[PDB]
Amino acid sequence: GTGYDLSNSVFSPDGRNFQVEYAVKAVENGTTSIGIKCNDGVVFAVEKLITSKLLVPQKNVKIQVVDRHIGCVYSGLIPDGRHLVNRGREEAASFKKLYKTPIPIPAFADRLGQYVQAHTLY
Amino acid sequence: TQQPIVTGTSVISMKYDNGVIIAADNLGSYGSLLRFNGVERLIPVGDNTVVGISGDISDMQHIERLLKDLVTENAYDNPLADAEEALEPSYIFEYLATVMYQRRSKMNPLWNAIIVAGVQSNGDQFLRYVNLLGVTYSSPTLATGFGAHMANPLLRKVVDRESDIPKTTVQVAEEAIVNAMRVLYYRDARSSRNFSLAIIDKNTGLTFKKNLQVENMKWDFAKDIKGYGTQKI
């Protein structure tokens, strides 16, 4: 039948999760942002559409830091992005508090990964 | 409710015309055993604040972690973290004060005595004390534990009231404080000869001096003293 795309955790007959795919549409509709890995670091950059002359220049920052060594940038629904960084920050604080050392990027990535994957289970 | 185990003794400080000075020896005592000697009890926060801590060391290390987090957290989504929106000494203090009082109110205190020294963004000197009871106060000079009885009287001979602040130079002040550290080494049985000193000047910034030592002590007259009354040799 149909209706497989109305509820979030449902598998369509071809094994897909339509809500996750519709989410992607929201991402593609967003501003473009990138990242470049260099020989000893990484660079992040993003496009900030100037809706009007009324936007105070340089003020509405989009890139966010996590702990003191991680940068995050995203495209799509900005509020969802912040929500994810907030979790990332708690995720990083928790890790440092227990292990003393600031959280490794691979570890941090999976923290974000498991959290997002979790939002496709219900 | 707990009981301190590894402890740090006195923390002395005072303010002068352009800033504030604060010092503390490098000892972590374990009862009467002078167990640890490389303990830094002066915690700098940014470059306008130094937090001196006495009392239970395990709790001090915990206050340390709290302070590092404050700095991290303040940076988040703050494009002015190193400018107009950086941590002021008064912010650091009010935070700690808040925690100390909440902890005593839950009958589980952070067994310490803290002195927050620093310079506010508008140049003002900041010197305030907070302890395990959550009690707080300010004075031109402030000392914890033993230094409250022996350091304060000396330091107060330099800056007796507010009006003496502008008349006190960094030299005079650092001298008073260095002498006080010697006196404490003379009469405090839980003190070390090594210590750290820090200056927070509205012009020269934060100067943190490590590995100082009490010097120029008087012990020679000890040879002339024998017996405890009638003994002659």
Swiss-Prot record, chain A:
Family: Belongs to the peptidase T1A family.
Signal sequence coordinates: none
Function per UniProt: The proteasome degrades poly-ubiquitinated proteins in the cytoplasm and in the nucleus. It is essential for the regulated turnover of proteins and for the removal of misfolded proteins. The proteasome is a multicatalytic proteinase complex that is characterized by its ability to cleave peptides with Arg, Phe, Tyr, Leu, and Glu adjacent to the leaving group at neutral or slightly basic pH. It has an ATP-dependent proteolytic activity.
Annotated protein name in UniProt: Probable proteasome subunit alpha type-7
Compartmental location: Cytoplasm; Nucleus
Top-rank lineage group of the source organism: Eukaryota
Disulfide bond entries: none
Post-translational modification: The alpha and beta forms are probably products of the same gene with different post-translational modifications.
Quaternary structure and interacting proteins, as annotated: The 26S proteasome consists of a 20S proteasome core and two 19S regulatory subunits. The 20S proteasome core is composed of 28 subunits that are arranged in four stacked rings, resulting in a barrel-shaped structure. The two end rings are each formed by seven alpha subunits, and the two central rings are each formed by seven beta subunits. The catalytic chamber with the active sites is on the inside of the barrel.
Additional record remark: Present with 12000 molecules/cell in log phase SD medium.
Swiss-Prot record, chain B:
Localization annotation: Cytoplasm; Nucleus
GO biological process: proteasomal ubiquitin-independent protein catabolic process; proteasome assembly; proteasome-mediated ubiquitin-dependent protein catabolic process
Pfam families according to UniProt: Proteasome
Coiled coil ranges: none
One annotated Gene Ontology cellular component of this protein: proteasome core complex, beta-subunit complex
Keyword Transport among record annotations: no
PANTHER family in UniProt: METALLOPROTEASE TLDD, PROTEASOME SUBUNIT BETA
Gene: PRE4
Remaining remarks: Present with 16900 molecules/cell in log phase SD medium.
Protein name: Proteasome subunit beta type-7
Species per Swiss-Prot/TrEMBL record: Saccharomyces cerevisiae (strain ATCC 204508 / S288c)
Free-text function comment from the UniProt entry: Non-catalytic component of the proteasome which degrades poly-ubiquitinated proteins in the cytoplasm and in the nucleus. It is essential for the regulated turnover of proteins and for the removal of misfolded proteins. The proteasome is a multicatalytic proteinase complex that is characterized by its ability to cleave peptides with Arg, Phe, Tyr, Leu, and Glu adjacent to the leaving group at neutral or slightly basic pH. It has an ATP-dependent proteolytic activity. PRE3 and PRE4 are necessary for the peptidyl-glutamyl-peptide-hydrolyzing activity.
Keywords carried by this UniProt record: Cytoplasm, Nucleus, Proteasome
PROSITE patterns: PROTEASOME_BETA_1, PROTEASOME_BETA_2
Domain of life: Eukaryota
